[PDB]
């Protein structure tokens, strides 16, 4: 059956509310993502600062830092 | 005049639906990135904990990073 103006309006409004919620969620996740990335960069800096120490535990941390999303350690 | 027609509301609905499909893609991408970085930090925290019986100051700075708000 063919929808009325009111029925399309209700669908539009439902989507608009959804849109506001998604914007809030994407902005929250963006913030948390950058937060964690900043931590990781700071830890990378601490490691580099202490690289003249050839510490194996620091090397384990570096390997965690450089693991790809496929699970392989590739520096940079 | 002032009231929108069925076709005009339909158009707005379709445009908003398309926007929401895009935002859902972005949410899921960001969720994956977030989990990726969070998992690295949890791994690093573990390495620091395994090694706390060293009183290494540098590990303490890393832990300070980990717990900063």
Curated annotation (Swiss-Prot), chain B:
Expression by tissue, per the entry, reads:
Ubiquitously expressed.
Question: Which residue ranges are recorded for the region named DCTN1-binding?
Answer: 28-69
Q: How is it modified after translation?
A: Acetylation at Lys-40 by KAT2B/PCAF promotes dynamic kinetochore-microtubule interactions in early mitosis.
Residue ranges of the region described as Interaction with APC: 27-31
Domain of life of the source: Eukaryota
Q: Where does the record place it?
A: Cytoplasm, Cytoskeleton; Cytoplasm, Cytoskeleton, Microtubule organizing center, Centrosome; Golgi apparatus; Cytoplasm, Cytoskeleton, Spindle
Region (APC-binding), start-end ranges: 40-62
All copies of domain EB1 C-terminal, residue ranges: 27-69
Which parts of the sequence carry N6-acetyllysine? 40
Region annotation (Interaction with SKA1) maps to 52-69
Q: What is known of its domains?
A: Composed of two functionally independent domains. The N-terminal domain forms a hydrophobic cleft involved in microtubule binding and the C-terminal is involved in the formation of mutually exclusive complexes with APC and DCTN1.
How does it associate, per the subunit comment?
Homodimer. Heterodimer with MAPRE3. Interacts with DCTN1, DCTN2, TERF1 and dynein intermediate chain. Interaction with DIAPH1 and DIAPH2. Interacts (via C-terminal residues 206-211) with APC (via C-terminal residues 2674-2843); the interaction inhibits association with and bundling of F-actin. Interacts with CLASP2, DST, KIF2C and STIM1; probably required for their targeting to the growing microtubule plus ends. Interacts with MTUS2; interaction is direct and probably targets MTUS2 to microtubules.
Tell me its family: Belongs to the MAPRE family.
The entry's function note states:
Plus-end tracking protein (+TIP) that binds to the plus-end of microtubules and regulates the dynamics of the microtubule cytoskeleton. Recruits other +TIP proteins to microtubules by binding to a conserved Ser-X-Leu-Pro (SXLP) motif in their polypeptide chains. Promotes cytoplasmic microtubule nucleation and elongation. Involved in mitotic spindle positioning by stabilizing microtubules and promoting dynamic connection between astral microtubules and the cortex during mitotic chromosome segregation.
Protein's name according to its UniProt entry: Microtubule-associated protein RP/EB family member 1
By which gene is this protein encoded?
MAPRE1
């Amino acid at each position: 059956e063919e929808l009325t103006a009111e029925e399309w309006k209700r669908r539009y409004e439902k989507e608009k509310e959804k849109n506001a919620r998604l914007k809030g969620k994407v902005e929250d996740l963006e913030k948390e993502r950058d937060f964690y990335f900043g931590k990781l960069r700071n830890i990378e800096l601490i490691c580099q600062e202490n690289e003249g120490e050839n510490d194996p535990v620091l090397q384990r941390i570096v390997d965690i830092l450089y693991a790809t999303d496929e699970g392989f350690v590739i520096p940079d």
